[PDB]
Design a protein around this ligand. Sequence first.
Ligand SMILES: *[C@@H]1O[C@H](CO)[C@@H](O[C@@H]2O[C@H](CO)[C@@H](O)[C@H](O)[C@H]2NC(C)=O)[C@H](O[C@@H]2O[C@@H](C)[C@@H](O)[C@@H](O)[C@@H]2O)[C@H]1NC(C)=O
Ligand SMILES: *[C@@H]1O[C@H](CO)[C@@H](O[C@@H]2O[C@H](CO)[C@@H](O)[C@H](O)[C@H]2NC(C)=O)[C@H](O[C@@H]2O[C@@H](C)[C@@H](O)[C@@H](O)[C@@H]2O)[C@H]1NC(C)=O
Ligand SMILES: *[C@@H]1O[C@H](CO)[C@@H](O[C@@H]2O[C@H](CO)[C@@H](O)[C@H](O)[C@H]2NC(C)=O)[C@H](O[C@@H]2O[C@@H](C)[C@@H](O)[C@@H](O)[C@@H]2O)[C@H]1NC(C)=O
Ligand code: MGC
Ligand code: MGC
Ligand code: NAG
Ligand code: CA
Ligand code: CA
Ligand code: MN
Ligand code: MN
Lengths: 237, 237
Amino acid sequence: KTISFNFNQFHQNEEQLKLQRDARISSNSVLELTKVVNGVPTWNSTGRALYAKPVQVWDSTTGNVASFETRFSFSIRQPFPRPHPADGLVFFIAPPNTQTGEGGGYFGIYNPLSPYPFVAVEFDTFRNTWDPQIPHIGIDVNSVISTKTVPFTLDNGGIANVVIKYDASTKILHVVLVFPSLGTIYTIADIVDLKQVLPESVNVGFSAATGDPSGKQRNATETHDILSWSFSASLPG
Amino acid sequence: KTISFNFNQFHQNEEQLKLQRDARISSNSVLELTKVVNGVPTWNSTGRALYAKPVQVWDSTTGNVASFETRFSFSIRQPFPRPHPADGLVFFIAPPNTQTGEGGGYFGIYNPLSPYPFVAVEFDTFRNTWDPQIPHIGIDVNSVISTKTVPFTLDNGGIANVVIKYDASTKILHVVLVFPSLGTIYTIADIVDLKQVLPESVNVGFSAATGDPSGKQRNATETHDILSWSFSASLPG
Ligand SMILES: *[C@@H]1O[C@H](CO)[C@@H](O[C@@H]2O[C@H](CO)[C@@H](O)[C@H](O)[C@H]2NC(C)=O)[C@H](O[C@@H]2O[C@@H](C)[C@@H](O)[C@@H](O)[C@@H]2O)[C@H]1NC(C)=O
Ligand SMILES: *[C@@H]1O[C@H](CO)[C@@H](O[C@@H]2O[C@H](CO)[C@@H](O)[C@H](O)[C@H]2NC(C)=O)[C@H](O[C@@H]2O[C@@H](C)[C@@H](O)[C@@H](O)[C@@H]2O)[C@H]1NC(C)=O
Ligand SMILES: *[C@@H]1O[C@H](CO)[C@@H](O[C@@H]2O[C@H](CO)[C@@H](O)[C@H](O)[C@H]2NC(C)=O)[C@H](O[C@@H]2O[C@@H](C)[C@@H](O)[C@@H](O)[C@@H]2O)[C@H]1NC(C)=O
Ligand SMILES: CO[C@H]1O[C@H](CO)[C@H](O)[C@H](O)[C@H]1NC(C)=O
Ligand SMILES: CO[C@H]1O[C@H](CO)[C@H](O)[C@H](O)[C@H]1NC(C)=O
Ligand SMILES: *[C@@H]1O[C@H](CO)[C@@H](O)[C@H](O)[C@H]1NC(C)=O
Ligand SMILES: [Ca+2]
Ligand SMILES: [Ca+2]
Ligand SMILES: [Mn+2]
Ligand SMILES: [Mn+2]
C-alpha cells in the first residue's frame, strides 16, 4: 500500500484540497494559508489546507505502521518588523474531519475544549510564554509545547525547502529546512510513535495563523504561503 | 567542557591534520583524498585525513556521551562514465592511531586482518555485492554493510554540502546531503549508541578509495575532494 500526490503549484477549486477558514489559493498559483489583502498580510487570521482524502498511517490488524516522506516549499514575508511578526505555520497530521482550532500561538490546530491528538512540525515566528527564542523549528505531539526545538534565521520573503521524513522501523521523524538563497541548512529530529498517538486513518496538511487580537498589535502578522507540496506514504501491512 | 574546530580551506602541510596514504592537499587549498595526476584521477588509490587530536565522545566516569555536529563540503568528479566509477568516500569515527584499511569497496576503513570498531557515513558510488543501487548514502557501524541507506543522484563535479548531527539524548545520527546547484536534498537517519561501539577517545576524519586492481578496470575511478570542514562536540562533564 503506497499512497502519494504532488502539486507543482495550486489551482483554484483544487478538488484534491480542503481549504478551511481564511485559506485561499491565489490566481498566481500559491496557497495562502492566512489572509493577505492587496499584497498586505492582516492580523486575526487563521487558515488550514488538508489533503481531501484520508491516509492510513497504521493498521491495527497487522500492527504495522507506515513510513512517509513529504517535501514542500513555503515563503514567509514579514512586512512589519516592529513590534513582532506572528505566528508561523505548521505541517500536521490529525484525525480526519477536524475543525480549525484556536489561532495565535496555537496555529489553528489546537482546540482546548475538544483537544484532538496530532503530530506537527512547526515553523514558529512568535515567542509565546512556552517558547524558546524564535524563529525556530519544533516537533509537536498533542501540544504546541515542542518536544524538540532548533533555532533558524528566516529568509524574509525568500523561498524555503522543507523535507520531512518518518521511518517506521526506527520511529525517527527527521526534518530538514533549507533556504537556497542563503545556503543555510537546519536539521532536527526526534522519536515519535505514531501508532501510540494517532488513529489508523488521518488527514495531512498545513495550518497557519497571524497575530491574535488579544495582543493588540495589528503589525503582528506575516504571510504563510505554500508554493508546492509532494507526499508519499508506504504501509507494508 | 568540549572541543571545536573549523577549516575554511586547507594549507599545505597542515599541522592540524594527519594525512595517510594517497591523501594530499592541493596547491589551491583542496583536500584530495585519492590520487589525481595532471587533473586525472587514478584507480588503485586510497587515502585518509584525520584530525590530529583525539576527541572524547564519552566518559566512563559519568557515563555521559557527547553530542556533536559536523559540516563539510566535498566534490566528486566522475570523468569516465563507463563502465563504473568507484568507490566513494566516508566520514568516520574510529579508535585513535589506526592504519588505513583495505581499499576498494572498503573505503580504506575496514581491515579484515585486524578489525577495529568504527561508525561511518558513506557516499558509495560503486555497487558491491553487499550494496543496493548506487550512488547512495549509508550509515555504517563496524562494517560497510550499512544499517540504513538512501539513494541519491550525484552532481558530477559539483559541490555537495553535508551536515551530520548526533544527539546523545535520543542517540539519533542524522545526515543531510544537499547539492546547491541542483537544489536537491537527501536525508537519512538511524539510532546509534556510540558508547556501545566506540572507546572514550576517538579520531574523526575522512577516507576514500578508487577502483581496486582486482576489478581490472582503470576507469573505475573518480575524485574525492574535501573543500571545507567544521566540527563541534559537546560532552557534558
Ligand atoms: C506598525 O507598522 C508600521 C509599518 O512598519 C510602523 O510605521 C512605520 O514606522 C517607521 C518607524 O519605525 C517609519 O519610518 C515608517 O514611516 C512607518 N510607516 C508608516 C508610514 O506607517 C508602525 O510604527 C508606529 O507608527 C509610526 C508612524 C511611528 O509613530 C512609530 O514610532 C510607531 O511605532 C508600527 N507600529 C508599531 C506598534 O510597531
Ligand atoms: C597499486 O598501488 C600499489 C601501491 O603503490 C602498487 O604497489 C607496489 O608496491 C611495491 C612494494 O609493495 C612498491 O615498491 C611499488 O612502488 C608499488 N607500485 C609500483 C611498482 O610503483 C601496485 O603496483 C603493482 O604491485 C606491485 C607489488 C608491483 O608488482 C608493481 O609493479 C605493480 O604495478 C599498484 N597496482 C597497479 C596494478 O598499479
Ligand atoms: C574507459 O574510459 C574511456 C574514456 O571515457 C573510454 O574511451 C573513450 O570512449 C569514447 C566512447 O565511449 C570515445 O569516443 C573516446 O574516444 C574514448 N577515449 C579513448 C580512451 O580513446 C573507454 O571505452 C572504451 O574505449 C573507447 C576508445 C571506445 O572504443 C569504447 O567503445 C570502449 O568501451 C572506457 N573503457 C571501458 C571499458 O568502458
Ligand atoms: C499576546 O499574545 C497573543 O498575540 C500575539 C500577537 O500580538 C501572538 O499572536 C500570540 O501568539 C497571541 N497569544 C495566543 C495565546 O494566541
Ligand atoms: C570487482 O570489484 C572490485 O573492483 C571495483 C572496480 O573495478 C571496485 O573497486 C570494487 O569495490 C572492488 N571490490 C572490492 C571488494 O574492493
Ligand atoms: C477576527 O476575525 C473574526 C472572524 O474572522 C471576527 O468575528 C472578529 O470580530 C475579528 N476580530 C477583530 C477585533 O477584528
Ligand atoms: Ca509561538
Ligand atoms: Ca560500494
Ligand atoms: Mn514554538
Ligand atoms: Mn554501500
